[PDB]
Amino acid sequence: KSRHTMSMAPDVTREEFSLVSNFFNENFQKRPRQKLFEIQKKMFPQYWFELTQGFSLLFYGVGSKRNFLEEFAIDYLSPKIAYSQLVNSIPCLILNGYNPSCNYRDVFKEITDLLVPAELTRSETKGNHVILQIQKMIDFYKNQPLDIKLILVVHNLDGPSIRKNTFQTMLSFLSVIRQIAIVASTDHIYAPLLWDNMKAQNYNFVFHDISNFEPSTVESTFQDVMKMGAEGAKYVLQSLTVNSKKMYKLLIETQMQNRGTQRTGVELKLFNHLCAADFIASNEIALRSMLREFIEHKMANITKMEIIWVPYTYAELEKLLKTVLN
Amino acid sequence: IKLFLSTDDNLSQTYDLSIISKYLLIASYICSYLEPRYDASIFSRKNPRYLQPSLFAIERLLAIFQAIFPSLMKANIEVFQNLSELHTLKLIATTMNKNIDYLSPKVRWKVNVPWEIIKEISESVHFNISDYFSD
Amino acid sequence: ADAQRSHYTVYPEKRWELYHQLHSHFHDQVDHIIDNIEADLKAEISDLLYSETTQKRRCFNTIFLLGSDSTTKIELKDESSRYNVLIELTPKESPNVRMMLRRSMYKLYSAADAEEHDVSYDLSLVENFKRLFGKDLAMVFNFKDVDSINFNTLDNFIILLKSAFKYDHVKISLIFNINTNLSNIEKNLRQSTIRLLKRNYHKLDVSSNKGFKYGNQIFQSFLDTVDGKLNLSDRFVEFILSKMANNTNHNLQLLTKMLDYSLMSYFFQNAFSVFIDPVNVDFLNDDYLKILSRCPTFMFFVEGLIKQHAPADEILSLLTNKNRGLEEFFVEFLVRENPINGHAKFVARFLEEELNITNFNLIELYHNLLIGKLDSYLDRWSACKEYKDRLHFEPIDTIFQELFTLDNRSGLLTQSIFPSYKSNIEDNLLSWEQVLPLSGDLDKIMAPVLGQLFKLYREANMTINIYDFYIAFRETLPKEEILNFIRKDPSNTKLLELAETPDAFDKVALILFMQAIFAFENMGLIKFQSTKSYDLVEKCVWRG
Amino acid sequence: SLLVKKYCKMTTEEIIRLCNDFELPREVAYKIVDEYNINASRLVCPWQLVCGLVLNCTFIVFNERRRKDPRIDHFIVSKMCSLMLTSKVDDVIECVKLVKELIIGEKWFRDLQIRYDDFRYDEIIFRKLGSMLQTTNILVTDDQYNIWKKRIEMDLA
């Protein structure tokens, strides 16, 4: 099974990747991107009018929408609605769904403090009373004068914590209230698996496409691939004793004398004698103790001759030869 | 005599769900016997009736759903609506815990309806199912 | 800057008023109908919860509320010298036999002290409730979502409640809010407990859609709110037939949504909306007079005018040669009441009580009226055969109604309410030209980053190799443009040392490839199968 | 029924005969040879693919007349239904819907739309965007109405 693999790739370090990535995402398709941004700007009065009807507005589409939501919520809408009702403008409570550390307790503790504490609602705070406390919020809000006092934003609604099911139903009861406007965005292709006709009854979602093919700068940070071990032990050797460099150099030679697999490895006895030959290893214990340091940071393997072999590729070890060992 | 030969302890529903959700159920029962080695041949666009049901994944439904529906349909928003409607009915449930099943991690699905309620609901939408079950 | 911190708050019309007098007036008819079923559901539980005096008097009364939406709230009678408390158990609060008992005893206990003006949270309070609180006890159990619970926990729960039947100062009542499928429920429990259940059961149906007593009602109250000032076209209403048929549980909240959004479309683009009150004739303008001309029933009647009157000197004069008679030609047909509304209200009350028929849908009754299929509508009962001549109406081809109408002739609310979700995404990624219009010269000769692999992503196998896909990805990139792009900037220095490297093109491809396939995981298009290997992945997204 | 008589080669002289009658410019007339040479390798049936591509470009290069005259849209297909001697118009439209998605993953059509500037563009960026101010085709548009008007009122007087 001769497969080309990501290990057999010309790799790129940390500062080299992120800088040339920053060059593309700020200079690749710049002119048509704001050219799209001016086209969709005329839809902004249409969103203002429908949002008076308490409609949970939901934005789908390819690409990141994070920049677009923050322009649309903060600068455009939130002072426009305060001027049209008649003083600080309408409070914006974003929810970063790409941040996995969102819970149901903490954000709702913000909500009841963002909303009015007209009564002693801490008396009803008791043991899951969250649905209980919001139910007492809802029926009171059915008989209030209709005006928006809060707009909340939920970025990346299919996020790693917001897509949890006890959190989803929590947002469902918020959306039936007329005083708050719910402007959220998702990115998943299976996002309408999240809602049944029970929740969408509470939601009354409407949909709009926004596809600007954004790079998702902030949304790439928490995510990881093998760019983010061959690269792990690449830094430990840069800070050690000078003898460990030499005893790894003698290790890496005869382990690449023969991918870097088990079969190219060496027996412990002769390697003790080999590192006794260059006046390096005194005995087995002095060898093994500064070999456990290569073991503790998982920089070498052993299987069974008593074969110690390096788990990095054929291409990687000669890169480890000519750069850091030399 | 009439009471002495009947139990009278049971206080067969034609099910409430809609038409596209009805075909959504009729495709989910297909992977109680239809393995991936055979299904794509016998359902071209060109017995475990007793046994416990196998495990789904996502989009194998819409693989079979698009085939067996009367190009006549393409919008799948209401099709995605009736899935978690069927999840609340506990007729198709998750293999794992009931939490993260949305975002496509490793999540396997399965029916929990016996054969007879499938058989009535096949004829309730005039669809024939006993042909495609072949020992 | 702060976006990695989660949930940081910050503290930064002649036409529309005629909408405002119409919208809320309609919504007063909505919510008043909503409290009617709210008073209906609260009534029929309340009488049936009481007055049921069984002879054995050692059994709880159970109630199965079939078809119920798991949200049905209940009020209780005061019924003095006895406290009556409500306990609700969510399936989220159903982990075991143990905490189902322990939270539920806690929930009534605080409800007991609040009416009363240290103890243990189990059945110890239940017997001593006569001494702990004076008056007796009649609790009720709002099992919200009953089919998600492991039933052996529920079966072991009800045997625990069976032990409370020997104290005679407490009365138990169970409310089973099923979603559906009563036959499923008698399959799951232990049969020894069904015989415990079957003492005094009551299968009350609670459904929002029950013989369309409210569905046909709310569409009827829609029609009088827009009576005579608009129309409802045929292609519009069949959308309301088809799509509302796809949602069994809650039609009534959905019919409010798609109708009010449809009314929002009319006020936002149509200029003749101001003329639905004839007081606004002074707002007439040549720009309004110009846009009246392209109405289809306007120009077709002119084609009807010439063939009927082969003398066309009158017809040419009433064209834009005059303007005073031209608008007078319009306001001749302005006040058209269109009695299809009133003829519907004529026949709606009739078969409701004259023939007394209830299994009927008023919307398709309105739709069959729009084509003339009212004769082939009443046939399904064969009861209007003595009345098909007096309930008869031929739908006349009315004139100037295309300016006062609602229809999805543009596919708007088809799109913006029921979006072809993975269709519109996949259409956005194959084409990309109808979404996007120094360095832009590169864009006219090179695709955007996400979409350029997508054509090969279609052309790849079921499970694919990572590197050969990149090898195919390097084919689509020509070499001369990138070195023209990487050497475009003389101002930056840190990029320019990479720009002069002779292997820069093969390095900048894997950087750019690992920004796109990095970005095809949050969309769930491609799944990394068997992580800590990631040599092959799986593609789930197919075109259909 | 020449379209169903499959497995025949349309040579370089033969294909330019098939496009000079439908008035194709030199830009696409070499491109049809270029993409048949792409698809002469991986074909299944040569008659179906060669006609499915020539209709949608004439749908996009003549749309300055096609959107301005609806009658010529039957004219261009029926003159091929006589040229290819087809059964009816049922099977020919089944071809043009087929290969359109089969050419949507290529390069040149995404150029040929944006090179010809043909489309209309601002409709699609307002239709796909879900604009409330999009055109509702319960109307006839002002241009086609004026096309209807000036044709009829000069026929009138």
Side-chain angles (χ1 to χ4, degrees), chain C residues 269 293-294 303 409-410 412 428 432-434 437 458, chain D residues 101 110 119 121 128 131-132 134 137 142 145 148:
Chain C
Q269 62 177 2
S293 74
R294 63 214 67 163
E303 305 149 0
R409 294 299 302 263
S410 89
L412 188 137
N428 276 353
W432 68 257
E433 46 85 14
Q434 73 272 39
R458 165 150 186 154
Chain D
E101 214 268 339
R110 320 198 323 269
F119 297 93
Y121 175 70
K128 188 219 284 175
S131 56
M132 200 65 69
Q134 72 173 356
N137 324 328
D142 178 277
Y145 173 74
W148 174 88

PDB file of all heavy atoms in Angstrom, chain C residues 269 293-294 303 409-410 412 428 432-434 437 458, chain D residues 101 110 119 121 128 131-132 134 137 142 145 148:
ATOM      1  N   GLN C 269     -42.524  46.616  -0.807  1.00  0.00           N
ATOM      2  CA  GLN C 269     -42.105  46.848  -2.180  1.00  0.00           C
ATOM      3  C   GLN C 269     -43.196  47.429  -3.074  1.00  0.00           C
ATOM      4  O   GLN C 269     -42.892  48.051  -4.096  1.00  0.00           O
ATOM      5  CB  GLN C 269     -41.592  45.546  -2.776  1.00  0.00           C
ATOM      6  CG  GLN C 269     -42.636  44.473  -2.831  1.00  0.00           C
ATOM      7  CD  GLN C 269     -42.118  43.231  -3.484  1.00  0.00           C
ATOM      8  OE1 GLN C 269     -40.954  43.166  -3.875  1.00  0.00           O
ATOM      9  NE2 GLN C 269     -42.978  42.235  -3.629  1.00  0.00           N
ATOM     10  N   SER C 293     -48.898  50.965 -15.465  1.00  0.00           N
ATOM     11  CA  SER C 293     -49.010  50.536 -16.851  1.00  0.00           C
ATOM     12  C   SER C 293     -48.582  49.090 -17.071  1.00  0.00           C
ATOM     13  O   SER C 293     -49.195  48.388 -17.881  1.00  0.00           O
ATOM     14  CB  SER C 293     -48.188  51.477 -17.732  1.00  0.00           C
ATOM     15  OG  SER C 293     -46.803  51.225 -17.580  1.00  0.00           O
ATOM     16  N   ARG C 294     -47.564  48.614 -16.356  1.00  0.00           N
ATOM     17  CA  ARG C 294     -47.030  47.274 -16.590  1.00  0.00           C
ATOM     18  C   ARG C 294     -47.793  46.175 -15.856  1.00  0.00           C
ATOM     19  O   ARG C 294     -47.267  45.063 -15.728  1.00  0.00           O
ATOM     20  CB  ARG C 294     -45.550  47.219 -16.208  1.00  0.00           C
ATOM     21  CG  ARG C 294     -45.279  47.470 -14.748  1.00  0.00           C
ATOM     22  CD  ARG C 294     -43.977  48.205 -14.567  1.00  0.00           C
ATOM     23  NE  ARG C 294     -44.059  49.556 -15.101  1.00  0.00           N
ATOM     24  CZ  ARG C 294     -43.203  50.525 -14.804  1.00  0.00           C
ATOM     25  NH1 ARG C 294     -42.199  50.289 -13.972  1.00  0.00           N
ATOM     26  NH2 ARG C 294     -43.353  51.729 -15.335  1.00  0.00           N
ATOM     27  N   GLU C 303     -55.643  44.757 -24.807  1.00  0.00           N
ATOM     28  CA  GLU C 303     -55.765  43.794 -25.898  1.00  0.00           C
ATOM     29  C   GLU C 303     -57.195  43.294 -26.028  1.00  0.00           C
ATOM     30  O   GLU C 303     -57.653  42.982 -27.131  1.00  0.00           O
ATOM     31  CB  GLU C 303     -54.805  42.622 -25.698  1.00  0.00           C
ATOM     32  CG  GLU C 303     -53.349  43.018 -25.516  1.00  0.00           C
ATOM     33  CD  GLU C 303     -52.588  42.051 -24.625  1.00  0.00           C
ATOM     34  OE1 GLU C 303     -53.201  41.074 -24.151  1.00  0.00           O
ATOM     35  OE2 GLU C 303     -51.376  42.255 -24.413  1.00  0.00           O
ATOM     36  N   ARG C 409     -44.749  34.426  -6.628  1.00  0.00           N
ATOM     37  CA  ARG C 409     -44.331  34.464  -8.018  1.00  0.00           C
ATOM     38  C   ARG C 409     -42.840  34.707  -8.172  1.00  0.00           C
ATOM     39  O   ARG C 409     -42.300  34.493  -9.260  1.00  0.00           O
ATOM     40  CB  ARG C 409     -45.107  35.549  -8.766  1.00  0.00           C
ATOM     41  CG  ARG C 409     -46.591  35.264  -8.883  1.00  0.00           C
ATOM     42  CD  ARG C 409     -46.810  33.980  -9.649  1.00  0.00           C
ATOM     43  NE  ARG C 409     -46.201  34.058 -10.970  1.00  0.00           N
ATOM     44  CZ  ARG C 409     -46.860  34.370 -12.080  1.00  0.00           C
ATOM     45  NH1 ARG C 409     -48.163  34.603 -12.036  1.00  0.00           N
ATOM     46  NH2 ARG C 409     -46.218  34.425 -13.239  1.00  0.00           N
ATOM     47  N   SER C 410     -42.168  35.143  -7.112  1.00  0.00           N
ATOM     48  CA  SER C 410     -40.733  35.357  -7.137  1.00  0.00           C
ATOM     49  C   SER C 410     -39.955  34.272  -6.410  1.00  0.00           C
ATOM     50  O   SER C 410     -38.723  34.272  -6.473  1.00  0.00           O
ATOM     51  CB  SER C 410     -40.394  36.708  -6.511  1.00  0.00           C
ATOM     52  OG  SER C 410     -40.201  36.571  -5.116  1.00  0.00           O
ATOM     53  N   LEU C 412     -39.714  34.074  -3.195  1.00  0.00           N
ATOM     54  CA  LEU C 412     -39.047  34.743  -2.086  1.00  0.00           C
ATOM     55  C   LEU C 412     -39.194  33.956  -0.797  1.00  0.00           C
ATOM     56  O   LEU C 412     -38.210  33.482  -0.223  1.00  0.00           O
ATOM     57  CB  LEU C 412     -39.632  36.141  -1.909  1.00  0.00           C
ATOM     58  CG  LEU C 412     -38.953  37.094  -0.931  1.00  0.00           C
ATOM     59  CD1 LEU C 412     -38.870  38.472  -1.568  1.00  0.00           C
ATOM     60  CD2 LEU C 412     -39.677  37.175   0.414  1.00  0.00           C
ATOM     61  N   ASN C 428     -23.111  27.424  -4.020  1.00  0.00           N
ATOM     62  CA  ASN C 428     -22.186  28.521  -3.787  1.00  0.00           C
ATOM     63  C   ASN C 428     -20.739  28.114  -4.011  1.00  0.00           C
ATOM     64  O   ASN C 428     -19.892  28.985  -4.229  1.00  0.00           O
ATOM     65  CB  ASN C 428     -22.355  29.060  -2.372  1.00  0.00           C
ATOM     66  CG  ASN C 428     -23.464  30.067  -2.272  1.00  0.00           C
ATOM     67  OD1 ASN C 428     -24.040  30.464  -3.279  1.00  0.00           O
ATOM     68  ND2 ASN C 428     -23.767  30.501  -1.056  1.00  0.00           N
ATOM     69  N   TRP C 432     -19.451  30.085  -7.687  1.00  0.00           N
ATOM     70  CA  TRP C 432     -18.802  31.235  -7.037  1.00  0.00           C
ATOM     71  C   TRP C 432     -18.723  32.511  -7.872  1.00  0.00           C
ATOM     72  O   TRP C 432     -18.298  33.549  -7.360  1.00  0.00           O
ATOM     73  CB  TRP C 432     -17.396  30.905  -6.488  1.00  0.00           C
ATOM     74  CG  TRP C 432     -16.262  30.598  -7.444  1.00  0.00           C
ATOM     75  CD1 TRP C 432     -15.773  29.359  -7.731  1.00  0.00           C
ATOM     76  CD2 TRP C 432     -15.455  31.525  -8.195  1.00  0.00           C
ATOM     77  NE1 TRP C 432     -14.733  29.449  -8.617  1.00  0.00           N
ATOM     78  CE2 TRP C 432     -14.519  30.766  -8.921  1.00  0.00           C
ATOM     79  CE3 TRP C 432     -15.433  32.915  -8.328  1.00  0.00           C
ATOM     80  CZ2 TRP C 432     -13.582  31.347  -9.769  1.00  0.00           C
ATOM     81  CZ3 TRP C 432     -14.510  33.488  -9.174  1.00  0.00           C
ATOM     82  CH2 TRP C 432     -13.594  32.706  -9.881  1.00  0.00           C
ATOM     83  N   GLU C 433     -19.177  32.488  -9.118  1.00  0.00           N
ATOM     84  CA  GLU C 433     -19.072  33.667  -9.962  1.00  0.00           C
ATOM     85  C   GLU C 433     -20.211  34.639  -9.731  1.00  0.00           C
ATOM     86  O   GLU C 433     -20.031  35.853  -9.870  1.00  0.00           O
ATOM     87  CB  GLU C 433     -19.005  33.249 -11.431  1.00  0.00           C
ATOM     88  CG  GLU C 433     -20.033  32.201 -11.863  1.00  0.00           C
ATOM     89  CD  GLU C 433     -21.384  32.772 -12.261  1.00  0.00           C
ATOM     90  OE1 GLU C 433     -21.485  33.999 -12.470  1.00  0.00           O
ATOM     91  OE2 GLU C 433     -22.345  31.981 -12.388  1.00  0.00           O
ATOM     92  N   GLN C 434     -21.387  34.126  -9.384  1.00  0.00           N
ATOM     93  CA  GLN C 434     -22.531  34.997  -9.179  1.00  0.00           C
ATOM     94  C   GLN C 434     -22.643  35.448  -7.735  1.00  0.00           C
ATOM     95  O   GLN C 434     -23.642  36.070  -7.364  1.00  0.00           O
ATOM     96  CB  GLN C 434     -23.809  34.293  -9.643  1.00  0.00           C
ATOM     97  CG  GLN C 434     -24.299  33.167  -8.751  1.00  0.00           C
ATOM     98  CD  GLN C 434     -23.691  31.835  -9.116  1.00  0.00           C
ATOM     99  OE1 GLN C 434     -22.512  31.750  -9.454  1.00  0.00           O
ATOM    100  NE2 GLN C 434     -24.506  30.787  -9.089  1.00  0.00           N
ATOM    101  N   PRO C 437     -17.851  39.480  -7.589  1.00  0.00           N
ATOM    102  CA  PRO C 437     -17.649  40.170  -8.865  1.00  0.00           C
ATOM    103  C   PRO C 437     -16.249  39.972  -9.434  1.00  0.00           C
ATOM    104  O   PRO C 437     -15.579  40.970  -9.704  1.00  0.00           O
ATOM    105  CB  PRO C 437     -17.881  41.640  -8.505  1.00  0.00           C
ATOM    106  CG  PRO C 437     -18.523  41.616  -7.148  1.00  0.00           C
ATOM    107  CD  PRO C 437     -17.962  40.431  -6.476  1.00  0.00           C
ATOM    108  N   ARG C 458     -15.405  17.034  -5.576  1.00  0.00           N
ATOM    109  CA  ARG C 458     -16.415  16.229  -6.247  1.00  0.00           C
ATOM    110  C   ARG C 458     -15.768  15.063  -6.976  1.00  0.00           C
ATOM    111  O   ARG C 458     -16.254  13.927  -6.920  1.00  0.00           O
ATOM    112  CB  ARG C 458     -17.224  17.092  -7.216  1.00  0.00           C
ATOM    113  CG  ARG C 458     -18.040  16.271  -8.197  1.00  0.00           C
ATOM    114  CD  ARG C 458     -19.313  16.936  -8.638  1.00  0.00           C
ATOM    115  NE  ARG C 458     -20.093  16.017  -9.459  1.00  0.00           N
ATOM    116  CZ  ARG C 458     -21.411  16.074  -9.603  1.00  0.00           C
ATOM    117  NH1 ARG C 458     -22.110  17.009  -8.973  1.00  0.00           N
ATOM    118  NH2 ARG C 458     -22.032  15.189 -10.369  1.00  0.00           N
TER     119      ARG C 458
ATOM    120  N   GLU D 101     -24.793  20.701 -15.171  1.00  0.00           N
ATOM    121  CA  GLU D 101     -24.122  20.406 -13.913  1.00  0.00           C
ATOM    122  C   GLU D 101     -22.817  19.670 -14.161  1.00  0.00           C
ATOM    123  O   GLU D 101     -21.914  19.684 -13.318  1.00  0.00           O
ATOM    124  CB  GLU D 101     -25.040  19.591 -13.003  1.00  0.00           C
ATOM    125  CG  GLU D 101     -24.881  19.881 -11.514  1.00  0.00           C
ATOM    126  CD  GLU D 101     -23.873  18.970 -10.846  1.00  0.00           C
ATOM    127  OE1 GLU D 101     -23.600  17.887 -11.398  1.00  0.00           O
ATOM    128  OE2 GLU D 101     -23.363  19.332  -9.765  1.00  0.00           O
ATOM    129  N   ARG D 110     -17.022  29.446 -15.927  1.00  0.00           N
ATOM    130  CA  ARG D 110     -16.924  30.475 -14.901  1.00  0.00           C
ATOM    131  C   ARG D 110     -16.153  31.684 -15.413  1.00  0.00           C
ATOM    132  O   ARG D 110     -16.320  32.797 -14.903  1.00  0.00           O
ATOM    133  CB  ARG D 110     -16.274  29.890 -13.651  1.00  0.00           C
ATOM    134  CG  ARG D 110     -16.760  28.482 -13.360  1.00  0.00           C
ATOM    135  CD  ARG D 110     -16.480  28.064 -11.930  1.00  0.00           C
ATOM    136  NE  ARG D 110     -15.202  28.573 -11.457  1.00  0.00           N
ATOM    137  CZ  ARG D 110     -14.058  27.910 -11.559  1.00  0.00           C
ATOM    138  NH1 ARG D 110     -14.040  26.714 -12.122  1.00  0.00           N
ATOM    139  NH2 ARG D 110     -12.934  28.442 -11.103  1.00  0.00           N
ATOM    140  N   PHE D 119     -24.847  36.913 -18.088  1.00  0.00           N
ATOM    141  CA  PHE D 119     -25.757  36.436 -17.025  1.00  0.00           C
ATOM    142  C   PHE D 119     -27.195  36.189 -17.483  1.00  0.00           C
ATOM    143  O   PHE D 119     -28.003  35.630 -16.741  1.00  0.00           O
ATOM    144  CB  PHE D 119     -25.750  37.416 -15.851  1.00  0.00           C
ATOM    145  CG  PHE D 119     -24.421  37.537 -15.178  1.00  0.00           C
ATOM    146  CD1 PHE D 119     -23.531  38.531 -15.562  1.00  0.00           C
ATOM    147  CD2 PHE D 119     -24.044  36.647 -14.187  1.00  0.00           C
ATOM    148  CE1 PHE D 119     -22.299  38.650 -14.955  1.00  0.00           C
ATOM    149  CE2 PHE D 119     -22.811  36.756 -13.575  1.00  0.00           C
ATOM    150  CZ  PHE D 119     -21.934  37.758 -13.966  1.00  0.00           C
ATOM    151  N   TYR D 121     -26.904  39.841 -13.654  1.00  0.00           N
ATOM    152  CA  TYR D 121     -26.058  39.650 -12.480  1.00  0.00           C
ATOM    153  C   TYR D 121     -26.687  40.175 -11.201  1.00  0.00           C
ATOM    154  O   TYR D 121     -26.717  39.482 -10.180  1.00  0.00           O
ATOM    155  CB  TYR D 121     -24.713  40.334 -12.705  1.00  0.00           C
ATOM    156  CG  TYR D 121     -23.804  40.305 -11.504  1.00  0.00           C
ATOM    157  CD1 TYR D 121     -23.219  39.124 -11.085  1.00  0.00           C
ATOM    158  CD2 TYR D 121     -23.528  41.462 -10.790  1.00  0.00           C
ATOM    159  CE1 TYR D 121     -22.378  39.087 -10.001  1.00  0.00           C
ATOM    160  CE2 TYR D 121     -22.690  41.437  -9.693  1.00  0.00           C
ATOM    161  CZ  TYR D 121     -22.119  40.245  -9.306  1.00  0.00           C
ATOM    162  OH  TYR D 121     -21.283  40.205  -8.217  1.00  0.00           O
ATOM    163  N   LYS D 128     -30.484  35.158  -4.807  1.00  0.00           N
ATOM    164  CA  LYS D 128     -29.835  34.200  -3.922  1.00  0.00           C
ATOM    165  C   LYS D 128     -29.616  34.804  -2.542  1.00  0.00           C
ATOM    166  O   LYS D 128     -29.582  34.097  -1.530  1.00  0.00           O
ATOM    167  CB  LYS D 128     -28.518  33.753  -4.550  1.00  0.00           C
ATOM    168  CG  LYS D 128     -27.809  32.620  -3.850  1.00  0.00           C
ATOM    169  CD  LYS D 128     -26.311  32.857  -3.866  1.00  0.00           C
ATOM    170  CE  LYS D 128     -25.726  32.549  -5.239  1.00  0.00           C
ATOM    171  NZ  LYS D 128     -24.277  32.888  -5.344  1.00  0.00           N
ATOM    172  N   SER D 131     -33.473  38.957  -1.165  1.00  0.00           N
ATOM    173  CA  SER D 131     -33.840  40.352  -1.007  1.00  0.00           C
ATOM    174  C   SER D 131     -35.343  40.531  -1.115  1.00  0.00           C
ATOM    175  O   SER D 131     -35.994  39.970  -1.995  1.00  0.00           O
ATOM    176  CB  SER D 131     -33.159  41.211  -2.067  1.00  0.00           C
ATOM    177  OG  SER D 131     -33.474  40.740  -3.364  1.00  0.00           O
ATOM    178  N   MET D 132     -35.886  41.357  -0.228  1.00  0.00           N
ATOM    179  CA  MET D 132     -37.283  41.750  -0.313  1.00  0.00           C
ATOM    180  C   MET D 132     -37.541  42.671  -1.494  1.00  0.00           C
ATOM    181  O   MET D 132     -38.683  42.786  -1.954  1.00  0.00           O
ATOM    182  CB  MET D 132     -37.695  42.445   0.983  1.00  0.00           C
ATOM    183  CG  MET D 132     -39.175  42.480   1.230  1.00  0.00           C
ATOM    184  SD  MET D 132     -39.718  40.786   1.458  1.00  0.00           S
ATOM    185  CE  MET D 132     -38.949  40.413   3.030  1.00  0.00           C
ATOM    186  N   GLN D 134     -36.447  42.197  -4.465  1.00  0.00           N
ATOM    187  CA  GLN D 134     -36.211  41.501  -5.716  1.00  0.00           C
ATOM    188  C   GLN D 134     -37.431  41.627  -6.613  1.00  0.00           C
ATOM    189  O   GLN D 134     -38.527  41.980  -6.171  1.00  0.00           O
ATOM    190  CB  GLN D 134     -35.884  40.027  -5.490  1.00  0.00           C
ATOM    191  CG  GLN D 134     -37.050  39.181  -5.045  1.00  0.00           C
ATOM    192  CD  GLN D 134     -36.696  37.709  -4.993  1.00  0.00           C
ATOM    193  OE1 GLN D 134     -35.591  37.314  -5.365  1.00  0.00           O
ATOM    194  NE2 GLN D 134     -37.632  36.888  -4.534  1.00  0.00           N
ATOM    195  N   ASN D 137     -42.148  38.299 -10.592  1.00  0.00           N
ATOM    196  CA  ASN D 137     -42.583  38.153 -11.978  1.00  0.00           C
ATOM    197  C   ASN D 137     -44.054  37.740 -12.053  1.00  0.00           C
ATOM    198  O   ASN D 137     -44.449  36.816 -12.763  1.00  0.00           O
ATOM    199  CB  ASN D 137     -41.685  37.153 -12.686  1.00  0.00           C
ATOM    200  CG  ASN D 137     -40.254  37.253 -12.224  1.00  0.00           C
ATOM    201  OD1 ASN D 137     -39.783  38.332 -11.866  1.00  0.00           O
ATOM    202  ND2 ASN D 137     -39.554  36.126 -12.217  1.00  0.00           N
ATOM    203  N   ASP D 142     -40.811  46.560 -17.235  1.00  0.00           N
ATOM    204  CA  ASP D 142     -41.029  47.835 -17.915  1.00  0.00           C
ATOM    205  C   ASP D 142     -40.422  47.872 -19.308  1.00  0.00           C
ATOM    206  O   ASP D 142     -41.013  48.480 -20.205  1.00  0.00           O
ATOM    207  CB  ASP D 142     -40.468  48.977 -17.053  1.00  0.00           C
ATOM    208  CG  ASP D 142     -40.611  50.353 -17.707  1.00  0.00           C
ATOM    209  OD1 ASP D 142     -39.763  50.732 -18.546  1.00  0.00           O
ATOM    210  OD2 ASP D 142     -41.588  51.062 -17.390  1.00  0.00           O
ATOM    211  N   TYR D 145     -42.552  45.424 -21.376  1.00  0.00           N
ATOM    212  CA  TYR D 145     -43.811  46.134 -21.547  1.00  0.00           C
ATOM    213  C   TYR D 145     -43.682  47.253 -22.562  1.00  0.00           C
ATOM    214  O   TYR D 145     -44.582  47.443 -23.381  1.00  0.00           O
ATOM    215  CB  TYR D 145     -44.297  46.707 -20.219  1.00  0.00           C
ATOM    216  CG  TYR D 145     -45.511  47.589 -20.355  1.00  0.00           C
ATOM    217  CD1 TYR D 145     -46.764  47.042 -20.595  1.00  0.00           C
ATOM    218  CD2 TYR D 145     -45.406  48.970 -20.241  1.00  0.00           C
ATOM    219  CE1 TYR D 145     -47.877  47.844 -20.721  1.00  0.00           C
ATOM    220  CE2 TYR D 145     -46.510  49.777 -20.375  1.00  0.00           C
ATOM    221  CZ  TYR D 145     -47.745  49.211 -20.604  1.00  0.00           C
ATOM    222  OH  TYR D 145     -48.851  50.015 -20.726  1.00  0.00           O
ATOM    223  N   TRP D 148     -43.559  45.646 -25.652  1.00  0.00           N
ATOM    224  CA  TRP D 148     -44.943  45.338 -25.986  1.00  0.00           C
ATOM    225  C   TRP D 148     -45.703  46.598 -26.385  1.00  0.00           C
ATOM    226  O   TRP D 148     -46.552  46.566 -27.278  1.00  0.00           O
ATOM    227  CB  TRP D 148     -45.632  44.642 -24.812  1.00  0.00           C
ATOM    228  CG  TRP D 148     -47.100  44.425 -25.036  1.00  0.00           C
ATOM    229  CD1 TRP D 148     -47.684  43.351 -25.639  1.00  0.00           C
ATOM    230  CD2 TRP D 148     -48.169  45.306 -24.665  1.00  0.00           C
ATOM    231  NE1 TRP D 148     -49.048  43.508 -25.667  1.00  0.00           N
ATOM    232  CE2 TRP D 148     -49.371  44.702 -25.078  1.00  0.00           C
ATOM    233  CE3 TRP D 148     -48.224  46.551 -24.033  1.00  0.00           C
ATOM    234  CZ2 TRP D 148     -50.611  45.295 -24.871  1.00  0.00           C
ATOM    235  CZ3 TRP D 148     -49.457  47.136 -23.830  1.00  0.00           C
ATOM    236  CH2 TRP D 148     -50.633  46.509 -24.249  1.00  0.00           C
TER     237      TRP D 148
END
